[PDB]
Amino acid sequence: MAPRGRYGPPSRRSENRVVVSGLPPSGSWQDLKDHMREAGDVCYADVYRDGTGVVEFVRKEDMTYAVRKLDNTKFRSHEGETAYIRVKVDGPRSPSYGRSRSRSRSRSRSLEH
């Protein structure tokens, strides 16, 4: 629950993307962006039919702002239906195989470094 800045020297940065949950029966990513736009300048936004979605901002400023200020906000669909949505910064999440990601992995036993 509590992040940190000492464990592994980053070397990717990534575009930074967050995930949303609480989309209506008749909604789309394009419609979500218009709502998240309040956070700042959106660069990308997608929404799965499962119910959850994802949004991407230019600078982290809009990211942290959205997950903070735009956290648990009532979403509005062009159809005329509201829906409680929640934003969160994409973190330790991988339905795929387990693989020690935030554990340790022992280390010091590879053929490189």
From Swiss-Prot:
It is found in: Cytoplasm; Nucleus speckle. The modification Omega-N-methylarginine is found at residues 4, 6. The modification Phosphotyrosine is found at residue 97. The modification Asymmetric dimethylarginine is found at residue 4. Phosphorylated by CLK1, CLK2, CLK3 and CLK4. Phosphorylated by SRPK1 at multiple serines in its RS domain via a directional (C-terminal to N-terminal) and a dual-track mechanism incorporating both processive phosphorylation (in which the kinase stays attached to the substrate after each round of phosphorylation) and distributive phosphorylation steps (in which the kinase and substrate dissociate after each phosphorylation event). Asymmetrically dimethylated at arginines, probably by PRMT1, methylation promotes localization to nuclear speckles. Residues 16-90 form the RRM domain. The modification Phosphoserine is found at residues 28, 94, 96, 100, 102, 104. The modification N6-acetyllysine is found at residue 74. Changing residue 78 to R: In NEDFBA; uncertain significance. Signal peptide: none annotated. Transmembrane segments: none annotated. It comes from the Eukaryota. Belongs to the splicing factor SR family. It is linked to Neurodevelopmental disorder with dysmorphic facies and behavioral abnormalities: An autosomal dominant disorder characterized by developmental delay, intellectual disability, speech delay, hypotonia, behavioral abnormalities, and non-specific dysmorphic facial features. Some patients have variable skeletal and cardiac anomalies. Plays a role in preventing exon skipping, ensuring the accuracy of splicing and regulating alternative splicing. Interacts with other spliceosomal components, via the RS domains, to form a bridge between the 5'- and 3'-splice site binding components, U1 snRNP and U2AF. Can stimulate binding of U1 snRNP to a 5'-splice site-containing pre-mRNA. Binds to purine-rich RNA sequences, either the octamer, 5'-RGAAGAAC-3' (r=A or G) or the decamers, AGGACAGAGC/AGGACGAAGC. Binds preferentially to the 5'-CGAGGCG-3' motif in vitro. Consists of two polypeptides of p32 and p33. Identified in the spliceosome C complex. Component of a ribonucleoprotein complex containing mRNAs and RNA-binding proteins including DDX5, HNRNPH2 and SRSF1 as well as splicing regulator ARVCF. In vitro, self-associates and binds SRSF2, SNRNP70 and U2AF1 but not U2AF2. Binds SREK1/SFRS12. Interacts with SAFB/SAFB1. Interacts with PSIP1/LEDGF. Interacts with RSRC1 (via Arg/Ser-rich domain). Interacts with ZRSR2/U2AF1-RS2. Interacts with CCDC55 (via C-terminus). The RRM 2 domain plays an important role in governing both the binding mode and the phosphorylation mechanism of the RS domain by SRPK1. RS domain and RRM 2 are uniquely positioned to initiate a highly directional (C-terminus to N-terminus) phosphorylation reaction in which the RS domain slides through an extended electronegative channel separating the docking groove of SRPK1 and the active site. RRM 2 binds toward the periphery of the active site and guides the directional phosphorylation mechanism. Both the RS domain and an RRM domain are required for nucleocytoplasmic shuttling. This is Serine/arginine-rich splicing factor 1. It comes from Homo sapiens. The chain holds residues 107 to 215 of 248 of the full protein.
